[PDB]
């Protein structure tokens, strides 16, 4: 019929529009490269990385000795999903405390920005949703604003970090004795 033919043409147009929209959604790239230098005078032992958003394809390096650096990366989930890569990295230190690092590379830059944070926790604490919420909402995170930021960590330690503002994020932190 003429009605049926119009329906098929409309459905074909909708199919092409849907394919284009899904391809566009799936081509957004959000990834994070993390580099942390250990000058704290103690060895770091990896515990876990809690991903609020996104995932990683590699192993979190088990040991970071003093004078060495941590290399890690992650990215958003494969496919046409509108989420970024957000998470916290937790490392156990020889003193018995935990070094926690937040990163946040959002999908939607109309509402969100890049954020990062560094904090030392007393005792051995694995990264989870509660730790991420603390570091993102209550512990004064740093904006990924192409700037350098310094802050004392307590426990005779201090941090100095940098994060850019684009969706190809890179986070670089130096942990040194205060």
């Amino acid at each position: 019929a003429d009605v049926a033919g119009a329906v098929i043409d409309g459905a074909g147009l909708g199919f092409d529009v849907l394919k284009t929209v899904l391809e566009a959604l799936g081509n957004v790239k959000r990834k994070i490269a993390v580099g942390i230098d250990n000058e704290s005078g103690k060895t770091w032992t990896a515990m876990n990385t809690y991903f609020r958003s996104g995932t990683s394809d590699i192993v979190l390096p088990h040991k970071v000795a003093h004078g060495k650096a941590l290399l890690y990366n992650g990215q958003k989930n494969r496919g046409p999903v509108a989420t970024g890569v957000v998470g916290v990295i937790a490392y156990s230190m020889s003193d018995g405390n935990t070094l926690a690092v937040l990163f946040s590379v959002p999908y939607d830059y109309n509402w969100y920005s890049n954020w990062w944070n560094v904090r030392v926790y007393k005792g051995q604490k694995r990264a989870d949703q509660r730790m991420y919420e603390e570091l993102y909402y209550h512990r004064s995170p740093f904006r990924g604003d192409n700037g350098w930021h310094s802050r004392g960590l307590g426990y005779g330690l201090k941090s100095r970090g940098f994060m850019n503002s684009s969706g190809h994020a890179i986070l670089e932190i130096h942990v040194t004795k205060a």
Copy 2:
């Protein structure tokens, strides 16, 4: 006729939709890379790898001496099938016991997660569906949550492992004397 022409147009649209759906289903990647370090003090002899889901394209290495590592990988079946790569690797140890390792990289992440497990069985036991069910449902598997996990294996052995959370899974285990 006009009815016949509409039928042919609808069939053509359905053909295009089916081709796109099959291509999307067949482009999902689920693979596992396994690396196990042998520091147990004994030689491991391969028995078999039971695949609940998926397959492998390579040989399970026959021997893993003390101080050496096991390299192995697998992936989901070729084609537009909605299954992952799930299985158990069994190795015979010089003491007469079996080292069994579980991996699970599901196709559908709406309902499933990455899981892994390590266990030592008394005697020589080949990997099968029963062993997989034990390791996956009853022996407290570890989640592939980008975290490090440790557990005593018995028989004077202990394990320490890591697995990420993405569909390009990597599993790394260290078996050492306890």
Copy 3:
């Protein structure tokens, strides 16, 4: 006419469907890589490879001395045919007996699996359909199940082999003195 135009549209749709189906049938890959180690203490002289299904593009190596290995491969027939690569390799040994090796990589995995077998025949026997049927139906073949299998061959010889379960099959056999 309107009837004639509908016929031409239907024939064009059928032509596209046929092209897609033939391309899909022709893209299925079934191949076998065979590696056999000779530690039997005697020299192997190639007789023939009987292909129940499929073919090979290379020469069957004429001699395999003790301490050396056989490299051979085959694959299914070119084109959109729904057959695999199935055959038996026969080598003459210095004692006057025949070493026969079965491989089977089927096209349809809904009904068939990978199979392999190793057997020593008295006298010089070339691989044919009867030998293939013996090795596949009556001599207890091993499943290509990503596992290691051992069996005494008689005549002071033993075999140990491995075959994976995918359509990119690899078969590895070690023939040693018992």
Copy 4:
């Protein structure tokens, strides 16, 4: 209907036009490469880079010693947005003052040109919107007109710089003792 078919055809034409327009808007390239030579006799420590428009994918180098150079680059935001890369780089100098550098590579060359500026601020001042507005509107910026420009900076320093006029901008500055 005939009205409905016309609507679907018009919508398809509009869809093609929209795709072409978005692809054209997204193919415009605006990037800046900055190189600043330090011959001032003092060490420069990076503070931040404020981006009025655009972003960067790399780290602002933390230190620039005397006799060394600064390498930095940026570009406009990914996607079909009609903005360029505009910003200010601020470095802290050993005397306690700030070296501020402006770059401006606009999207729309019908109305804007390439601009740059160099200025020394008393005290440690991070780059922000106010600093950018000062350098761009009130401190006599130099045009990116493929010409060399020199100006005394005060504090016993002078600058000499060059910037081309295209959308693949390169800015080169030499800061020397006056």
Copy 5:
């Protein structure tokens, strides 16, 4: 008209079908690689290669000394023709006799197989249709069945050859003193 439009549509469909058929016919590959080892104790001088089907792109090597090998190849005619590569290679030997070698790689494997033959002719005889017919129909050719075959040639010589069964044919012969 409506009749004329239907004719043009049918002709276009037939044109597409014809292009697909010709492309399929022209993508069939039939080639032969010949290697003959000379251990006869005499020098071979090339006479000619008669091609019943197909052709060659290279020169038939003029001399093959004792302890050396002959390299030669051929293939079916370019274009969408349904013929293979079939022919006879004739070499003159130092004793005044002719070494004749048959190869046959058919286009249609529904009806034909790979065949080869080796024979020594008294006197100097150039390869022609009669020689090909003798070798193919009356001199008991060997099947290209992935097997090794041996036969005494007379004149104190013997041959041992191998040919696979696929359209990428390879023929390997060793001519030695009997």
Copy 6:
């Protein structure tokens, strides 16, 4: 409607024509490579390059010592604009005078040709529109006619240059003591 359908077909045809025309306009290449040898006995210091048409992607080299050469290039603006690359290069000399070099590579060769000129100005004069007009209209420029041209520059200097006639222009000038 039938009128509305015709309008949409006409608009689609016009869209395709516009895309082809814009692509053709944007594929015209006009670029200039400038090489000037300094044998004048004095050092050249770059002032600026005034572009009447086109732009450059590189830095104008700040110094050209005696016995060295100047490498510079430019090209027309990116996109489907119908303009070439036309400009004047000005260098300050050690004697206090200015060496000015004109190049002109037009977009439209139906009306314009390649032109170049070399002149020495008294005092330090930056290249601008007035200098370009002098060199192009009033100072007898040389045609880019694949020929060599010589002219005394005054101030004890002479020039010898060459320019080809194509849209991939190259200008080579030697400035020597007269």
Copy 7:
């Protein structure tokens, strides 16, 4: 109109058919590679190559000394023309005579074959149409039949040559003292 629309559809179909036919005609390859060894004891000086059909892209080597070889090639005319590469090569010898070599690689193998000829002419004679006709029709040319042919040339010289039968022709000739 309906008549006018049918005419436009027919013209479009004819346009596609013409494009396919021209592309097919232009994809036929006919080329010749000539190699001639000079063992005549005298130096060869090139005169010319007369092309009855086709052309060459290279220089005919001016000198061929004794103990050296001639490398030359040609091919059919570019474009969809149905002609091959046919010609005669003429070289002047130190004795005052001309060495003439014919080659013929036709476009249409339904009616023509590959032919070649070698002849020595008294005096210095340049290759032309008459010489080509002599060598092709009256001087008993050799068929390019994948065979070796020998013939005395007179003047204390003899020739031995080979030519294959395909459209990628190669001609190899050895001119030696008789």
Copy 8:
């Protein structure tokens, strides 16, 4: 309307035909490579190259010393124009005379052939249209007929040259003392 729809279809067909015709016209290649060996005993200084048709992308080398060679090339104008590359190269010699070389590689081989000429002019004469007309119409040019040609130049010089007959023309000349 039906008339308007037919007009739009005819215009679209004409657009496709025009695009194909322009692409075909623009794919014709006509280029010349010139190599002249200087054994005249004097230095050659480049004057210019007058292009009757076509252009060059490189510099005419300023000096050619005795015992050296001239490398030069040219080609037809970019775009779908039906012209070749035709011109004259003029070099000033140490004796005060001019060496003039003609090349002509036409676009239309239905009516024109490759031509070349070499001549020595008394005094210093730049190549122009009159010189080209002399060399092409009145000074007996040589055909680019894949042959070697020699001619005394006067002034104690002689020339020997070669030019092929295809659109990828190469001209090689040797100028030696007579």
